[PDB]
């Protein structure tokens, strides 16, 4: 239930998230675009600096007034085919180099930590105060800097499928934000889009997002969601921890199958006032796919000895999730002390470096970094026994993959629905049906993906914001309005792209999208969006 | 009637040789006749079956069904075609084990060694 104090806690979390996103954007621009910095920063350094900045900023807010506050989502930097879960520690850089020596260079940016021109860099971070969570995620583009222009600018706009994915994600984000804002004043919903006297539904959300994705020739990655957020329940680990109640719309391989054939989440709800909504949309480009196929996810392991595929990425996930329902008294004193530190963090995913007493840095020092690494060695020693007794689990690294439909149809599964992954460590992904109508299990689909020679990895663009549907008493302006805690025109400004694809205006859904854009621009009689501003540091 | 003293008409020996033949011998044992079109085109009658050639079923309940060879399961003296399956309600698909003597090749997978084999059997390709 929205209140002045609850809204203020959400607002402060959103402000800290916006400031952190501006910080990472400035760091990346200085390292790769401005080039004032002598040595370019790497991805683990950027993640660590972002986390330290967030902790330093959050130290001053709600101190000695709130039991639990901290980082909700660790800083994740995903490049191209990687659709989530990439937050490596600083002590795994040489590990990554040694594990990926002799592989292809398709994941060279992730392996070396150094960004390259043409990269789609997706930055995700979240902040919670008293369990009230605000999460932001922005795709940006890395460009070569033109040496001839007096001012710094890209030589040319980004072109191709990555540009299509960025455009689709940005336009879907804006349209969904406007559509969810329309729930407060339902009469302003366009007639071509849906019923004037009726509200916003998950069916309308899904058909709008699918229409935008199909227009821009992109698929929706099966991790996308437009869901409701409560205290401590923000989907911070959605594929790992089951939830009692779910109110939102999700996209899966089952939904892709149903669209082709045209506590379980269902799109049979009505958006209500006084609610907080997370919108996380991942769009994968389908430019290189000459036929109709299915978009799925591939989990990255750290074992180089499982295959001979030179186009494989070998890495260890850096974010862990504590399972508070599991208890086991450990044998190592280091492991027991680490578990005591872990239980202080709460119910959000955490990095091993977040548990260091040296972290966050008061002054950025080489000695501070070295003491952090010295802590991290014993932290890994304790984490080995913690993970062995199922007290904590890894947050997976996932690569988007494309599997054609003809290979799936020609394949034979002798088990049907009965097959499942017995070696899987987590319950929720281990027993899953990605293709319920075809009777294909997750293990069977992974086997098909590995068996096909024409299964490729699709570039992904991501946009994720948090919004509040503020009622008239809740809002300052005496009218219902949408408060965007994260994202907007100041932090998530789109990069220079040029996409040949476009929305086709001769469709009712596209006309409703254009009218939603018009009514969002209309600041007099239309809808009211209040963006949350990043704060100044000096 | 046999005339060579090096060949045996013993049923026990023949059956043991068949059921203990190694993989390379089973390749020859698993031969399929060509279609009439391919027989006229290439000038040969039968070839050992391999993975990527298209076949027509001419015997059994699956007679008339066409498809591409999916596997040559030499361990069970059978071939598997992609389109010929047994289906269940739960979504299970079990390949039908077909014998190449009951199949007809309608399109050969042609490589260098396949062309050499056809020519040394007496082919007239192109």
């Amino acid at each position: 239930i929205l209140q002045e104090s609850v809204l203020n806690k959400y607002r402060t979390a959103g402000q800290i998230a916006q400031t952190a996103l501006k910080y990472v954007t400035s760091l990346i621009n200085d390292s790769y675009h401005s080039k004032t910095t002598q040595r370019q920063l790497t991805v683990p350094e950027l993640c660590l600096l972002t986390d330290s900045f967030i902790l330093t900023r959050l130290e001053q807010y709600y101190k000695n007034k709130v039991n639990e506050r901290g980082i909700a989502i660790p800083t994740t930097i995903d490049i191209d085919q990687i659709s989530g879960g990439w937050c490596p520690e600083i002590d795994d850089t040489q590990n990554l180099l040694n594990w990926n020596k002799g592989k292809d260079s398709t994941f060279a940016s992730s392996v070396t930590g150094t960004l390259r021109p043409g990269d789609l860099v997706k930055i995700t971070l979240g902040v919670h105060i008293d369990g009230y969570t605000s999460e932001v995620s922005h795709t940006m583009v890395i460009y070569p800097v033109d040496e001839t222009k007096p001012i710094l600018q890209p030589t040319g706009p980004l072109l191709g499928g990555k540009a299509d994915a960025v455009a689709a994600a940005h336009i879907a984000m804006e349209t969904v934000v406007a559509l969810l804002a329309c729930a407060l004043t339902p009469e302003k919903l366009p007639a071509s889009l849906g019923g004037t006297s009726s509200g916003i539904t998950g069916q309308l959300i899904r058909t709008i997002v699918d229409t935008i994705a199909r227009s821009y020739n992109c698929g929706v990655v099966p991790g996308s969601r437009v869901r409701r957020i409560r205290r401590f329940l923000a989907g911070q680990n959605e594929g790992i921890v089951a939830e009692r109640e779910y109110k939102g719309v999700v996209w899966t391989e089952s939904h892709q199958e149903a669209d082709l054939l045209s506590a379980i989440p269902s799109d049979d709800f009505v958006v209500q006032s006084g609610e907080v909504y997370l919108i996380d949309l991942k769009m994968a480009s389908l430019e290189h796919c000459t036929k109709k196929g299915l978009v799925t996810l591939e989990t990255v392991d750290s074992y180089t000895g499982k295959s001979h595929k030179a186009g494989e990425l070998i890495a260890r996930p850096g974010a862990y999730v504590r399972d508070f329902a599991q208890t086991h008294i450990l044998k190592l004193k280091t492991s027991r002390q680490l578990l005591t530190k872990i239980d202080k963090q709460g119910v959000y995913p955490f990095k091993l470096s977040h548990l260091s007493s040296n972290f966050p840095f008061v002054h950025e020092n080489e000695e501070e970094l070295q003491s952090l690494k010295k802590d991290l060695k014993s932290f890994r020693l304790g984490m080995s026994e913690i993970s062995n007794n199922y007290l904590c689990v890894e947050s997976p690294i996932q690569i988007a993959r494309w599997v054609p439909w003809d290979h799936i149809l020609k394949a034979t599964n002798p088990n049907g629905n009965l097959s499942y992954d017995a070696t899987s460590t987590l319950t929720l992904p281990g027993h899953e049906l990605p293709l319920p109508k075809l009777g294909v299990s997750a293990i069977k689909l992974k086997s098909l993906m590995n068996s096909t020679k024409e299964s490729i990895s699709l570039p992904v663009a991501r946009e994720c914001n948090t919004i509040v549907l503020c009622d008239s008493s809740v809002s300052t302006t005496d009218r219902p309005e949408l408060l965007r805690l994260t994202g907007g025109s100041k932090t998530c400004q789109p990069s220079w792209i040029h996409s040949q694809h476009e929305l086709n205006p001769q469709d009712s859904i596209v006309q409703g999208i254009f009218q939603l854009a018009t009514l969002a621009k209309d600041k007099r009689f239309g809808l009211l969006l209040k963006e949350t501003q990043p704060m100044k540091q000096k | 009637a046999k005339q060579s003293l090096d060949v045996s008409s013993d049923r026990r020996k023949a059956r043991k040789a068949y059921f203990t033949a190694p993989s390379s011998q089973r390749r020859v044992l698993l031969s399929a006749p060509l279609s009439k079109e391919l027989r006229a085109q290439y000038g040969i009658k039968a070839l050992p079956i391999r993975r990527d050639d298209e076949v027509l079923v001419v015997r059994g309940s699956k007679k008339g069904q066409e498809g591409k060879i999916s596997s040559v399961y030499r361990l069970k003296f059978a071939v598997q075609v992609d389109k010929v399956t047994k289906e269940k309600v739960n979504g299970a698909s079990v390949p039908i084990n077909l014998h190449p003597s009951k199949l007809v090749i309608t399109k050969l997978h042609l490589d260098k060694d396949r062309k050499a084999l056809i020519q040394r059997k007496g082919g007239k390709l192109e």
């Binding site: 960025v166 054939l261 149809l409 | -």
Partner: peptide, 26 residues
């Protein structure tokens, strides 16, 4: 067979522009 009918339907169903941003680094 319902699975066979589903597979047959699947086989049946499978058988200017836009510009964002500008010449600047946000």
């Amino acid at each position: 067979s319902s699975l066979t009918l589903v597979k047959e339907a699947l086989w049946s169903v499978i058988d200017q522009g836009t510009t964002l941003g500008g010449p600047f680094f946000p």
